[PDB]
DNA sequence: AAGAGTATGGGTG
DNA sequence: CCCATACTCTT
């Protein structure tokens, strides 16, 4: 956008991008939990073979 | 939609955070969900038995 | 591992500056740091600011001294205009610590170097400071000869001479 | 009560300089237009933090006021955050979204 | 002119000269008691000068010509 | 402190390639610099990019279309200006995009640019196998066939290059003295 | 903490430091380098003289600001005079020319 | 009462806070059951059994 | 009688 | 830790 259009459109675009990203990150509801860290089932057998 | 089974990119939260570049990296995910690995003594030598 | 001085002596200025730029960029690239090559080139240009006369010719120089390259070039072109024969020289390469210690201003030198040595040497030599650099004008609270102040200083040069 | 309206009038188009120590690459000082807020903390735009290397866990900043017309015009035309979009070191943009965006 | 000065920079051709020309015009409007050449929209003298510059109404040559004309008129009207 | 010194000197810019891997493309090393020589087409004698041209994005795309692998550019080291430099030997102002203006303190900018990433640097402590299809080129080569049916090079500064279909050096290697070459110069591999 | 004007040191004639003394913020060498890299000469000169230790310049700037005239008349910092006196006290003749 | 950004967990690798949050939720749930039993006056036998 | 090498001191963080 | 200088053994 900066290389094709210029400076002012780039500033406007950056502000709009920030606003949209914040709004949809809030809307998604993305969280972190203990069940998100999935351990592979073959870890124990690899450790045993080593 | 036809009732079959398909494989797609995961919507896992940690995977989404790492894949988009928002936060984290491969090594940190490996520490979280896989073995941490070999550690070094203060001089610099590698301890034979890893974590 | 070859030395930069031999690279400059045998191959030339372009070879040594290419060598230094390549080494620094190789060091910086391992960490994923992006730096343009202009900046290293201006640092290297600041490093190459002394020349050793090998032959005096029709000049007022010796044959074993080390002096500013700009003064040598100006004297050479002036003598060539006057029809006489200029001097021949070989470029030098100095570290940044040594290069910055050869400034021609005692206020600027005393600002950051060891103050006692600089002040003693300047007092013994009876030096005179023209206040041409940025740091000197910062010390006495004037406009720096750069940016929006640059034109101002030109007017000074327009009125002094 | 009238001095608050006077203050709102006198800061309408007067830039200020924000600086965070240590200053490393000239992007540690930038110019902004003030918006008067309640409280005791300075609000910072999320897209400039990477230039300041700043985060909101205890960092502090200093604010300076230009006085003369030349200083105000230098702040507007040279140091304004909308002029410093590309990096002086490599030419890449510095106001890049991160994390939540 | 309120958010960016790109047009004024293009018109003048240099940021460092733009600052000086704008400062001269702003001091004329603030202390010299002259009137702006653009409709004042509740702006400070600096912003008014920048908007005049980006409109093609103010540059160094124009200021010099106006100054010489006013000096000549004052000299004529002195007697 | 000046606009143009008029010098014809410069330095050669080529892609940075280490071993069999390409590290730095040409476009990232000539974007924003002023050409010190006319950029001629590899096949013809026609002038593609004239003398003293500021290589912006369009010129870089044009150069990559014609597969140019070396360009001579102006640098501040070989500048004729005394007590400063000129705008054309410096080139583009990276923070803005146009050419540099007179009166800018480029030394402070360079020092800050080098020193700012200093906190990301740590403070405390026998064969050549070509990976890509192409042709074998030899520089400073002195080869002879021995009684054992081996093409041994008697030169100690031989450089082995992989030339692609576009005349580019895909890979570069150092050939030690006493090596046995499977194929000669100009042979496709 | 904020400050417009206040008390100054007796020797250097510069604003004091600390919130307890109602002091000002330090504008060190790195900030000067940043201003030099920007090219803002008038901002730097104003920061160096009429804001810290130009005794006549401070008063003139305050009067002009109250009168609505945003212009300065910089002079010599007092610290440079102190430095000249200190160097002269060491038996060395240092002086200004013309 | 508080909203915290989940983006601060994965790179810092301080997973103790997630487990503490889960265990505090469980403890508050037990307390809620006890409070509900106390509000509607019940026998001491049921309270001590629970 | 020069010339290369070693012990001592200054300024720096 | 790095560089400059007075004193000592060698060709
Ligand atoms: Mg912090
Ligand atoms: Zn030049």
């Amino acid at each position: 956008c900066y290389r094709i259009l210029g400076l002012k459109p780039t500033v406007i675009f950056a502000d709009q991008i920030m606003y949209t990203g914040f709004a949809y990150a809030a809307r998604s509801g993305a969280s972190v939990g203990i069940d998100d860290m999935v351990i592979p089932e073959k870890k124990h057998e690899i450790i045993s073979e080593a | 939609r036809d009732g079959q089974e398909e494989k797609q990119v995961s919507f896992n939260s940690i995977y989404m955070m790492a894949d988009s570049g928002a936060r984290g990296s491969a090594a940190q995910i490996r520490q979280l969900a896989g073995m941490r690995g070999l550690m070094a003594k203060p001089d610099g030598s590698i301890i034979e038995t890893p974590i | 591992p070859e030395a930069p001085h031999d690279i400059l002596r045998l191959r030339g200025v372009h070879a040594v500056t290419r060598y230094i730029v390549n080494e620094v960029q190789d060091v910086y690239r391992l960490q994923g740091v992006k730096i343009n090559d202009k900046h290293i080139e201006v640092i290297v240009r600041q490093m190459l600011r002394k020349a050793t006369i090998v032959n005096a010719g029709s000049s007022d120089f010796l044959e074993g001294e080390q002096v500013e390259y700009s003064r040598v070039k100006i004297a050479n072109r002036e003598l060539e205009a006057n029809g006489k024969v200029g001097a021949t020289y070989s470029r030098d390469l100095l570290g940044i610590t040594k290069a910055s210690l050869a400034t021609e201003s005692f206020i600027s030198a005393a600002s950051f170097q060891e103050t006692t040595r600089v002040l003693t040497e300047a007092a013994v030599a009876g030096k005179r400071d023209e206040l041409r650099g940025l740091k000197e004008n910062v010390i006495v609270g004037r406009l720096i000869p750069a940016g929006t102040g640059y034109a101002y200083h030109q007017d000074r040069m327009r009125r002094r001479a | 009560a009238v001095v608050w309206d006077i203050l709102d009038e006198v800061i309408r188009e007067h830039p200020v300089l924000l600086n965070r120590a240590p200053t490393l690459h000239r992007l540690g000082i930038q110019a902004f237009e003030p918006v008067l807020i309640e409280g005791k903390a300075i609000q910072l735009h999320p897209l400039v933090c990477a230039a300041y290397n700043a985060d909101f866990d205890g960092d502090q900043m200093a604010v300076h006021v230009p006085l003369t017309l030349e200083a105000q015009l230098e702040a507007r035309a040279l140091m304004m955050s909308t002029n410093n979009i590309l990096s002086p070191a490599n030419g890449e943009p510095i106001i890049v979204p991160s994390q939540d965006v | 002119a309120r958010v960016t000065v790109q047009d004024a920079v293009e018109k003048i051709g240099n940021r460092f000269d733009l600052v000086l020309v704008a400062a001269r015009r702003a001091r004329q409007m603030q202390v010299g008691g002259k009137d702006p050449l653009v409709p004042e929209e509740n702006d400070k003298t600096t912003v008014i000068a920048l908007r005049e510059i980006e409109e093609g109404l103010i540059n160094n040559q124009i200021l010099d010509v106006r100054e010489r004309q006013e000096q000549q008129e004052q000299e004529a009207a002195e007697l | 402190t000046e606009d143009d010194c008029g010098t014809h000197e410069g330095i050669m810019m080529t892609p940075v390639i280490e071993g069999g891997d390409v590290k730095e493309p040409l476009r990232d090393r000539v974007l924003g610099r002023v050409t010190a020589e006319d950029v001629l087409k590899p096949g013809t004698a026609d002038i593609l990019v004239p003398r003293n041209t500021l290589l912006h994005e369009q010129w870089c795309d044009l150069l990559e279309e014609n597969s140019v692998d070396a360009v001579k550019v102006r640098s501040v080291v070989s500048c004729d200006t005394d007590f400063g430099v000129c705008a054309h030997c410096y080139g583009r102002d990276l923070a803005r995009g146009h050419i540099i203006n007179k009166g800018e303190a480029i030394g402070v900018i360079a020092a800050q640019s080098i020193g700012e990433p200093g906190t990301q640097l740590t403070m405390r402590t026998s064969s050549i196998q070509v990976k890509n299809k192409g042709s074998i080129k030899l520089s400073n080569v002195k080869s002879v066939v021995n009684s054992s049916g081996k093409l041994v090079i008697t030169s100690r500064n031989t450089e082995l290059k992989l030339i692609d279909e576009f005349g580019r050096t895909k890979e570069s290697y150092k050939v030690p003295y006493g090596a046995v070459l499977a194929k000669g110069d100009g042979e496709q591999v | 903490h904020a400050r417009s004007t206040g008390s100054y040191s007796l020797v250097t004639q510069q604003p004091l430091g600390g919130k307890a003394q109602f002091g000002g913020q330090r504008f060190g060498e790195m900030e000067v380098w940043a201003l030099e890299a920007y090219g803002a000469a008038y901002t730097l000169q104003e920061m160096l003289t009429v804001k810290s230790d130009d005794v006549n310049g401070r008063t003139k700037m305050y009067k002009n600001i109250v009168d609505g005239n945003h212009q300065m008349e910089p002079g010599m910092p007092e610290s440079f005079n102190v430095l000249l006196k200190e160097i002269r006290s060491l038996g060395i003749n240092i002086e200004l020319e013309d | 009462d508080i909203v915290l950004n989940p983006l601060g967990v994965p790179s810092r690798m301080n997973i103790g806070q997630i487990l503490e949050t889960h265990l505090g939720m469980a403890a508050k749930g037990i307390g809620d059951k006890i409070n509900a039993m106390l509000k509607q006056q019940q026998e001491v036998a049921k309270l001590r059994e629970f």
Side-chain angles (χ1 to χ4, degrees), chain G residues 19-32:
Chain G
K19 183 181 176 179
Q21 279 105 333
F22 198 72
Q25 308 299 316
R26 179 173 175 84
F27 206 82
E29 301 188 36
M30 303 183 189
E31 289 78 24
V32 177

Side-chain angles (χ1 to χ4, degrees), chain D residues 20 54-59:
Chain D
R20 176 191 174 267
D55 51 353
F56 311 104
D57 63 353
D59 300 20

Side-chain angles (χ1 to χ4, degrees), chain F residues 5 74 79 86 89:
Chain F
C5 59
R74 309 178 68 174
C79 187
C86 68
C89 277

Side-chain angles (χ1 to χ4, degrees), chain F residues 164-178:
Chain F
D164 62 350
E165 54 176 352
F166 302 146
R168 312 168 184 173
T169 302
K170 290 287 188 173
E171 312 183 16
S172 177
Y173 300 90
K174 178 81 172 186
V175 187
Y177 175 83

Side-chain angles (χ1 to χ4, degrees), chain C residues 2-159:
Chain C
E2 50 187 350
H5 303 65
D6 294 65
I7 299 182
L8 174 59
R9 186 181 67 252
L10 303 188
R11 302 183 188 179
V13 172
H14 289 8
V16 68
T17 185
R18 176 178 302 111
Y19 164 82
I20 295 183
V21 166
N22 283 253
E23 297 297 327
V24 174
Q25 290 285 33
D26 290 3
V27 174
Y28 271 92
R29 195 179 297 104
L30 281 177
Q31 311 296 337
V33 176
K34 293 180 73 277
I35 298 178
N36 207 280
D37 298 326
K38 298 177 173 68
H39 314 295
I40 314 177
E41 288 172 15
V42 328
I43 298 296
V44 169
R45 179 194 189 276
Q46 287 299 96
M47 292 173 71
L48 309 167
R49 276 207 284 97
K50 298 297 184 179
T52 295
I53 307 301
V54 293
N55 176 27
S58 178
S59 307
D60 199 7
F61 293 150
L62 307 174
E63 293 187 13
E65 64 175 19
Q66 177 184 64
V67 278
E68 286 283 351
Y69 178 81
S70 60
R71 302 223 304 260
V72 175
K73 178 161 50 63
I74 291 179
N76 272 69
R77 70 162 59 95
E78 193 276 337
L79 293 173
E80 186 171 351
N82 287 339
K84 279 82 80 61
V85 47
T88 49
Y89 50 82
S90 64
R91 299 293 294 269
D92 290 330
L93 176 52
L94 309 179
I96 57 178
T97 305
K98 248 50 185 176
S100 59
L101 258 52
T103 181
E104 62 281 0
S105 178
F106 74 91
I107 297 291
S108 174
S111 297
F112 65 95
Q113 303 182 33
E114 187 214 340
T115 311
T116 297
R117 196 202 80 260
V118 173
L119 287 187
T120 307
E121 213 270 323
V124 166
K127 299 178 184 175
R128 186 177 187 266
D129 202 322
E130 261 71 29
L131 308 172
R132 299 296 173 88
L134 271 62
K135 191 178 297 180
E136 300 90 280
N137 294 274
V138 165
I139 293 290
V140 298
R142 288 184 173 182
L143 287 176
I144 57 174
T148 55
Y150 181 76
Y152 172 89
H153 280 252
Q154 302 307 117
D155 276 332
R156 249 90 291 266
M157 186 264 293
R158 200 166 308 172
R159 305 199 308 182

